[PDB]
């Protein structure tokens, strides 16, 4: 449309704006003044129609986003780069008989030590820039500006939690789809069949059995056995929301909840598992639209001509762009009737949050300081605990 | 030399690692683990063949590397640039000729002189960047990483000191070869000959000799003479190590009346006193492996296309590169039979080390701290004192 309004022509006059005084090295110096009228438009009160509209309140809505797996995070000292782990293999007790060679008292019996070696994590970062001259134009108190500068920082803390939660629930799905042996994998047919298999596979744990760990794919655990038990306070089911709303909707969940464990809190569920995408073919970045799309999510450092290695993760939806298609697949469970019953001690997860507030670079040319948040996060998954995958594949 | 061992193929996979995670903008973000087997490897033990091997001990040799020239250092102010010194040249007496006219009294005989304008020195610079991200992937103790961060810093001063003595040694040898007279040079024939021509070159520096200095290379002294003596408490003999070793094991160890004629208190010595290079013909940089060889010695600021002036000094073995052959000559005597017997206080050496440890720059984008070390060193040789070269 179009409006021949006296106020709207003053509002839409873009040559008077504050942006004209900050995108030109010479600009206006003195202000004449403006005739503001609220007649036959919006912002019109019944009394005193010539005053500029005034703000009742401004409200920074800050939601404290939380990493669901924060209680698993150990803290190391960020020294060295290889963590390894090892168990002792089973040696079942044998009967004694008093009619032997009796020099077998001299004989040896060593422990057997299945191990596995783990690499490193990666150091992740993010930055934000707060200035001192232009962003003061729209807060009208000092307190709102300080709350803004604080809420930007707390948002930079909360999206670390979002990143780590989505990253670990990508890890646990990529594991169960592409790494796990087909001995832990039970196969269902329908939804109630899968529910009965989940409820009998919870009870398949708490048993001294050597069947449910992948100790055969440890480094030295091929021959022999390794017996694992697990309590109920460290069993976590990872599944979908559409299937948590059916597992909890059974009488067995009621008798689990009554006089016992919080079964609503042991079943960790999401809408569909995976918004995280991997890389299968080593490509490069060519298009400026993809660069602007990566800038929209805070990825400031990547430019044209940068290459992406096979195995890189993204944590957001990338796959609609012109050169990611074909090279980028999704960590998503096939045939979404899906449940991965793990022991929560199998998630080897530790961080290094010591000194994650690096001192700011001031940049006094534009008077815009910048804070960086560096942290080290190691994500792995151990073979020495009970795991069961239940799918239709 | 091909290996199908599973642990060797596990190590040979360069795609898994600290390197590809730190080169790219996105990378893998978890680790499934690797089956490490010590069997049939260098890392094999007999009781447990499935662990990664261990370090108990990590050393870092530290050597301090002194200077052998810093009694000549005069701590100056570093203000202004042009210094200047002069002497008044000699005028011999003439005869009283009474036949000349009486207005010879009114003509002025001005005293003539010879100066030498020096100029500035060289602000010298080196830096080092210590990392907080990837240096800590080594150094299995925090104390080892702090020892490393201190050992780098203590190495920087050590190769300031050895650099300053290489430059002083090169200044004295390059001055002995190029800028001298015909009177100053001698020709020895062997080592037993040079060990006595040094002994008779002392007792020549301390006569009233208009020669043995180089005031003809001063500003006003092209025509005329200037006589200078020495005191033998000021004479420096600069030789190789072979000459001093030969003195101490043969001439001092095979004479009876040694009680007066020992000059080895005044002898500075070097094992091999040519290792420093110059420039001729004014090349520039165009090859990749040349600046790759320059990066190994700490020179970070050279890019391709940077031009090198006609008198620059390279101080390490540099003449084997593709560009520098024919344009770069070595400051060395051609015989390994060499003695430069010069008067001290002819070597001015004024370095400036006050604002030397400049405050760091923490670079938190890469989480690193760069430290700089700056000093101003002026070294020069006055042409107004007695010098003798003995060589081949």
């Amino acid at each position: 449309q179009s409006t021949k309004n006296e106020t709207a022509l003053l509002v839409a006059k873009s040559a008077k704006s504050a942006l004209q005084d900050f995108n030109h090295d010479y600009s206006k110096s003195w202000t004449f003044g403006d005739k503001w009228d609220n007649s036959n438009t919006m912002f019109e009160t019944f009394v005193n129609k010539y005053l500029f509209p005034k703000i009742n309140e401004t409200l920074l809505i800050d939601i404290a986003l939380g990493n669901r797996f924060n209680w698993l995070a150990k803290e190391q000292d960020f020294i060295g780069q290889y963590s390894e782990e090892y168990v002792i293999m089973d040696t079942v007790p044998i009967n004694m008989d008093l009619s032997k060679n009796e020099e077998l008292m001299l004989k040896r019996n060593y422990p057997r030590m299945a191990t596995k070696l783990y690499g490193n994590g990666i150091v992740k970062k993010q930055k934000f820039t707060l200035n001192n001259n232009d962003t003061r134009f729209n807060f009208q108190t000092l307190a709102d500006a300080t709350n803004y500068a604080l809420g930007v920082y707390k948002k930079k803390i909360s999206d670390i939690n979002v990143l780590e939660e989505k990253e670990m629930r990508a890890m646990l799905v990529d594991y169960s789809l592409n790494q796990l042996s087909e001995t832990n994998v039970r196969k269902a047919t329908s939804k109630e069949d899968l529910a009965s298999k989940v409820f009998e596979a919870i009870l398949n744990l708490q048993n001294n059995s050597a069947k449910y760990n992948e100790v055969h794919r440890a480094s030295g655990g091929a021959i022999g056995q390794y017996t694992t038990v697990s309590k109920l306070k460290d069993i976590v089911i990872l599944t979908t929301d559409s299937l948590k709303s059916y597992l909890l909707d059974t009488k067995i969940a009621n008798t689990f909840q009554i006089a016992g464990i919080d079964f609503t809190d042991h079943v960790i569920s999401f809408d569909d598992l995976g918004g995280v995408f991997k890389v299968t073919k080593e490509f490069k970045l060519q298009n400026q639209d993809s660069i602007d799309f990566l800038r929209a999510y805070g990825d400031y450092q990547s430019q044209l001509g940068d290459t992406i290695p096979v195995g890189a993760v993204f944590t957001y939806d990338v796959s609609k762009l012109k050169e990611f298609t074909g090279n980028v697949e999704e960590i998503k469970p096939k045939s979404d009737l899906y449940a991965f019953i793990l022991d929560i001690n199998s998630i080897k997860y530790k961080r290094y949050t010591k000194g994650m507030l690096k001192p700011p670079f001031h940049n006094p040319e534009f008077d815009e300081v910048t804070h960086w948040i560096h942290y080290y996060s190691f994500k792995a998954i151990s073979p020495f605990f009970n795991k069961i995958l239940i799918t239709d594949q | 030399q091909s290996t199908k061992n599973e642990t060797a193929l596990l190590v040979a996979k360069s795609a898994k690692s600290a390197l590809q995670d730190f080169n790219h903008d996105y990378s893998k973000s978890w680790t499934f683990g690797d089956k490490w087997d010590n069997s049939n490897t260098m890392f094999e033990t007999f009781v447990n063949k499935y662990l990664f091997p261990k370090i108990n001990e990590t050393l870092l040799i530290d050597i301090a590397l002194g200077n052998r020239f810093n009694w000549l250092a005069k701590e100056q102010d570093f203000i202004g640039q042009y210094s200047e010194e002069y002497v008044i040249m000699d005028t011999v007496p003439i005869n009283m000729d009474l036949s000349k006219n009486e207005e010879l009294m009114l003509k002025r005989n001005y005293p003539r002189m010879a100066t030498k304008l020096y100029g500035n020195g060289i602000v010298k610079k080196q830096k080092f960047t210590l990392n907080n991200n990837d240096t800590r992937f080594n150094f299995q103790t925090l104390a080892d990483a702090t020892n490393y961060a201190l050992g780098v810093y203590k190495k920087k001063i050590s190769d300031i000191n050895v650099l300053e003595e290489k430059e002083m040694r090169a200044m004295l040898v390059d001055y002995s070869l190029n800028q001298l007279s015909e009177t100053n040079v001698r020709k020895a024939t062997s080592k037993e000959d040079l060990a006595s021509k040094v002994f008779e070159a002392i007792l020549n520096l301390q006569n009233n000799s208009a020669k043995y200095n180089e005031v003809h290379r001063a500003s006003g002294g092209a025509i005329g003479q200037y006589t200078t003596v020495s005191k033998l408490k000021d004479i420096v003999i600069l030789t190789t190590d072979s000459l001093k070793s030969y003195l101490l094991d043969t001439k001092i160890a095979n004479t009876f009346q040694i009680a007066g004629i020992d000059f080895t208190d005044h002898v500075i010595s070097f094992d091999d006193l040519g290792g420093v290079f110059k420039v001729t013909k004014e090349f520039k940089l165009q090859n990749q492996d040349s600046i790759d060889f320059l990066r190994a010695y700490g020179d970070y600021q050279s890019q391709l296309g940077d031009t090198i002036p006609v008198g620059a000094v390279f101080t390490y073995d540099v003449s084997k590169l593709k560009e520098f052959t024919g344009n770069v000559e070595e400051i060395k005597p051609k015989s390994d039979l060499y003695a430069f017997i010069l008067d001290i206080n002819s070597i001015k050496y004024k370095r400036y080390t006050k604002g030397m440890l400049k405050p760091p720059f923490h670079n938190p984008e890469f989480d690193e701290v760069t430290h700089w070390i700056h000093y101003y060193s002026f070294k020069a040789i006055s042409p107004f004192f007695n010098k003798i070269l003995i060589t081949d």
Binding site: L65, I157, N161, E164, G355 | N132, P360, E368, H371
Partner: peptide, 27 residues
């Protein structure tokens, strides 16, 4: 193990690690 000039400028204090102040928000 040897101190020498131990507490030098900011990196020699950065390895003797500093400021465990901020952590993440659930637990």
């Amino acid at each position: 193990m040897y101190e020498g000039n131990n507490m030098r400028s900011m990196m020699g204090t950065s390895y003797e690690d500093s400021r465990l102040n901020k952590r993440t928000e659930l637990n």
